Automatic annotation (TrEMBL), chain A:
It comes from Emaravirus fici. This is Nucleocapsid protein. The keyword Cell cycle does not apply. Disulfide bonds join C28-C33. It comes from the Viruses. Keywords: Capsid protein, Viral nucleoprotein, Virion. Its main location: virion. It is found in: Virion. GO terms for cellular component: viral nucleocapsid.
Length: 258, 262, 263, 256
RNA sequence: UUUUUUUUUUUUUUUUUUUUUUUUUUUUUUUUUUUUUUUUUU
């Protein structure tokens, strides 16, 4: 009754992800990419309606498409992949070490033309953590950061630990479970390390357990430095305190009314 | 009449109105082509979200069709059906060929299926739900692993219960989200069993003795033999434990740094 | 779009316009019992129809109701809101099922003047009462309806008791967890605030005006079979029987793993 | 297969400081007050389309739905529109405004005063015991926290009444105690720089006695009851009653 | 393994109270249905 169907095609699912950040390492203009990352919230909402074309250097661009699980075309990417590509462009000039997976260690990033991202460009996700502009981690705090695990595994894992521990400081909704917070990263770890055969401790030793620690304390140092939940909670305690101070003058006013 | 009211007929809700046409798969035994419905079951997840936006129409054979509609509940004609019952109808179109017997509730016994010549399903068609359980193409149970499989309890009871047992036991292996409690995994089957066995007036053991408990177990081992010993949900669980263990061993350096910081 | 609307400057000064003066006693003898029972049997469907149009509900051979959504005040007796409509027709069945009603002037329950000994049809089923384990023929069967709180005027202890049942057994009644406890009793308290004038009277005073013994009597009547038979009980017993099935099947998977012969 | 071009525009600290002092002499008092009487009405209209409101024959005020910053000084958000208009009436009812440079109250500088017509009704002030004619009648408006710039002790005191008398004023339980004060704490954080200065220093600068005089003025005629107080009192007596009947129900099951 | 999910410094935005009402509104609709969930260990 009063329903228009659509005629679904008879197509069977028959049998038959090469994404690597190393194909986009020298395609980014730093201040262009940082500006796009500074508007990630507005960009994700624009994506919900139409797909987006983002210029990331005066000769290169990306096509951000929703629900894109595969593409032979390199610069057609999902939102998380696009932010990760653009973040890596900035982190090549802020982080001095990157991970070589066949050498199983951190090797120095050789950046001949090393530049400083414009301090004026603000990352509001990073401010929520208490990080200030100029911090080398500043532009790692982006949507889709988990893809950066390919280059910065200790740093990306550390940011994930901070999101797990301080979900309330970062205004993560209590709706989300701890599994959803870490799921994306575990998927990237499982691909790199083969977690079906490997141990987690084997991965935490392959990357620097102390490296994770140093990155963790860098990203965690200034959490709770200024908190609107603690700022509001002191006001309520100070307000209810002043209400109590005002009671004898309120009853003096009502005994005067009678 | 400013309030332009519409008359409403005085029709009382009685169980004679509720049970006018209860659903049964026996009306749909010859409506589906094996390789056509498996192509629709192979794309069940896509169908479900495409169903959300607008309701759907699915050709199952040369002239017979099925219209899928969300939140349908009752309906006065046979080929207009909900998502779960549509997947159940198509599933039974392949299992008539892959399963050698079906249950007869008149006789309290499984009976051999009369399936003329049996057309073996194309092993090119891949059911991803069965692949999560380790099943491969050509397995007879392959196309039983569909949404709304519980409706197949009427034809293949012991096999549908064994699958539900497999989903409760291996819920983390099958990435069933911890949001759903154990009772949620089995709720629909219990409803299917309630209708057929009237569990209000029958025990659980009586049901599992009417159907074959020897049949259930041997379907349980067929469905759980190749279930993987890893999953993303189990990897996520192991990660949360390891991550909190790292967070704990990092707290001294953290607090020592903040007292030294401005 | 992209340009504003000039709003006119006029204030808000006005009167209470309390014109409702709604009492169920205006509709006592206007209802055919089986006609009204049948409209109540389709309450959910009629509310859905009400979202699209105003409704015309014939309640007897000589009377009808006009159901209108968002009906604040109406001067005409026939034009009522949905909650008022179900309450009006529920009272028509309850006059024949319940033997006593409250008289607020005498401050006690008095006998209902049912001259005609009419029973509501047994086959007409109230799904809302079915969710409570009440079977057809129960004298309370037709108080379990949308807008039941209006019946506090006639059956105060029984309407309060059903509200208590909705409070304690909210899970068995499939009431959403997302709705306040206060939201479930909010409208009954509006009724109680009108009849008992709760601004200048206590809840304990009101609970002594109607019978606390009478609220308890109706409570055990309405809550006797709430948990009698549950999905939560059935689905739970299934789990443990399913889990002993599994524990008995584990020697089976193991034997099929390490043994080639039939076991 | 279709994209839209996103232009490179970074979020910077650079991108108009809001001061009510820019709107002190643009409001007729009986017309700015009539807009505040139909504030709930003006509010839902703002989701449909942006609204243009007249403060007087010579000046306009256009309100839009989600303004985080505006180059224009006459397009504002709702809470600022109400505050700009309420301020127009309180310059004639309040006899003192705050000067943050001199760190204390000074006269409101209104040579010729007006008395608002007493028929314009503020239903929000009517939920409390305020009757028309009270000098605080038109401060009880949506967006009052912005008036902390001019009347900080009175605006804080109103916040105190909302905190303690939230049930009396039907503030839903879904609104946190923090949510009631979250907006005012933000206005104070801008003016007082709360990371550096404390609440006690703010309270001493505005006057804890000035707060007290506005408090007893606003909390004087709060009604003893509300729907929310009744519902909350009913739930308790209702949960008392269930317990009192639990023996009787168990006895009934044992009998049959 | 992708997809997907969530966080957006500060001010803002937003949120809430509507002449202490009554109404309106809201929620439950037997059993079954609906709903829900897993998607080739990715
Ligand atoms: Mg924030
Ligand atoms: Mg039900
Ligand atoms: Mg009102």
């Amino acid at each position: 009754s009063d329903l228009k169907p659509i005629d679904v095609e008879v197509q069977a699912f028959t049998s038959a992800s090469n994404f690597t950040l190393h194909k986009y390492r020298n395609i980014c203009h730093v201040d262009t990419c940082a500006a796009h990352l500074s508007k990630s919230k507005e960009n994700k909402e624009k994506l919900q309606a139409r797909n987006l074309r983002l210029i990331v250097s005066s000769n290169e661009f990306l096509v951000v498409v929703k629900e894109l699980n595969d593409s032979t075309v390199d610069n057609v990417v999902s939102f998380n992949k696009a932010c990760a590509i653009m973040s890596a462009g900035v982190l090549k000039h802020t982080f001095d070490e990157e991970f070589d997976w066949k050498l199983s260690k951190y090797v120095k990033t050789n950046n001949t033309t090393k530049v400083i991202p414009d301090v004026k460009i603000i990352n509001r996700l990073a401010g929520q953590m208490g990080l200030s502009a100029g911090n080398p981690y500043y532009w790692m705090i982006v949507p889709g950061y988990e893809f950066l695990y390919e280059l910065y595994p200790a740093e990306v894992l550390a940011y994930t630990l901070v999101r797990l521990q301080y979900r309330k400081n970062l205004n993560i909704p209590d709706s989300m479970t701890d599994a959803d917070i870490v799921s994306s990263l575990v998927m990237k770890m499982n691909r790199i390390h083969k977690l079906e055969q490997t141990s987690f401790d084997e991965a935490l030793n392959l990357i620097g357990k102390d490296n994770v620690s140093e990155a963790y304390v860098e990203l965690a140092r200034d959490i709770g430095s200024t908190s609107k939940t603690k700022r509001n909670d002191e006001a309520i305690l100070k307000f209810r305190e002043l209400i109590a101070s005002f009671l004898p003058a309120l009853e003096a006013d009502r005994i005067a009314s009678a």
